[PDB]
Design a protein around this ligand. Sequence first.
Ligand code: HEM
Length: 143
Amino acid sequence: VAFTEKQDALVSSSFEAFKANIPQYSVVFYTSILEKAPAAKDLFSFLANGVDPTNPKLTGHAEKLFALVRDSAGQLKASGTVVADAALGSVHAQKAVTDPQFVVVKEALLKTIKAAVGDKWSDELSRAWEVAYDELAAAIKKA
Ligand code: HEM
């Protein structure tokens, strides 16, 4: 999987824009997911009492999630291949991680990066994140 230097640079950068406001951007992410995925509210431990930007568990999970996708970009740029930890592979093996759900989370992710970058959005940017997310979603299912 071809992933260039430039594409890696687009994602490290826009990720930084995401790090500027985790509570606010992590609201866009979750709201999107709960909007299109019925099982979501019951699956996440922290989604119990809704989307709460003050819950560090919610905000911390979103940070974890996006760092891993930025990390997927760095692995692809370096080797052309991404691997997911076995533990991360099993947390998902339960079920609701149906394949359609993966697409719902990708959609939430791009929409979040879009809210974060503002006027810096371009198709190049979306594309850099889509690949890194897809490669990591494929690694997760199989590792
Ligand atoms: C490729 C994108 C994905 C990444 C990078 C990812 C990453 C993560 C991480 C970092 C954790 C575990 C942290 C921990 O051990 O507590 C986690 C937990 C979880 N994820 Fe994913 N995830 C992905 C997609 C999804 C999708 C498609 C679903 C389905 C709705 C999902 C469902 C869950 C559930 C229910 C948990 C447990 C929540 C908790 O920490 O209590 N994730 N995810």
